[PDB]
């Protein structure tokens, strides 16, 4: 009985609480709270009534089996991992795609999906890139930002929305939400001079241009 209180002591550094166990003892007020002290189923038949044993014995046994592995602890499935993100990449940043068929295209970053990929979109009206997932590792974070704190991106779209289903035809759902968020960033990118022209141009390396030497 009771609504649980949040963890009383705050984390100081990973694995080290801020309060010692004696201060933790008085903080929980524990000093005043000392505590002292299926398989069988019967069915009727038209005979008598039979008792079925659910989950009956296996009717086959392989010639050989493998033994069970030992127990590890720090190994979680991918859905439970912690999702990092570069400090340079912040919502409103302009990125540069490197791997996918949109090489070099300068796109605008919106949000990071739970799966870990970035929900990026260059304005499809400019660089021909729709709402598209992208891995943060294969992008360059340009130091030019726009303020998209006033855009209401739909929450119905997620990593499951962009998952490859199974010839590919664009759904009407893909089109409608496309113009929905594009109609809110295009008025913002046009506020910055020559920005829409910067998004149409692709990134490329020319003679004497050295990535380690240049900042972006």
């Amino acid at each position: 009985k009771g609504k649980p209180h949040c963890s009383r002591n705050p984390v100081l550094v990973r694995g080290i609480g801020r309060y010692s166990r004696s201060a933790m003892y008085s903080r929980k007020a524990l000093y005043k709270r000392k505590y002292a002290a299926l398989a069988t189923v019967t069915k009727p038949v038209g005979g008598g009534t039979r008792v079925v044993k659910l989950r009956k014995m296996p009717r086959y046994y392989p010639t050989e089996d493998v033994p069970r592995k030992l127990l590890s602890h720090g190994k979680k499935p991918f859905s439970q991992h912690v999702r990092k993100l570069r400090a340079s990449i912040t919502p409103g940043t302009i990125l540069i795609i490197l791997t996918g068929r949109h090489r070099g295209k300068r796109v605008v970053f919106l949000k990071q999906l739970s799966s870990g990929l970035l929900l990026v979109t260059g304005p499809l009206s400019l660089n021909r890139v729709p709402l598209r997932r992208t891995h943060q590792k294969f992008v360059i974070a340009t130091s030019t930002k726009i303020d998209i704190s006033g855009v209401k991106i739909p929450k119905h779209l997620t990593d499951a929305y962009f998952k490859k289903k199974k010839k590919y035809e664009i759904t009407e759902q893909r089109k409608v939400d496309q113009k929905a968020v594009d109609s809110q960033i295009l008025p913002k990118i046009k506020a910055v001079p020559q920005l829409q022209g910067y998004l149409r141009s692709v990134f490329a390396l020319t003679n004497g241009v050295y990535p380690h030497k240049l900042v972006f």
Partner: peptide
């Protein structure tokens, strides 16, 4: 208290400590 044999009667107040 930490002695295994001659600490048995010593670490018995601890049984009543959490109670």
């Amino acid at each position: 208290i930490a002695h295994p044999k001659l600490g048995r009667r010593a670490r018995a107040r601890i049984a009543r400590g959490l109670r």
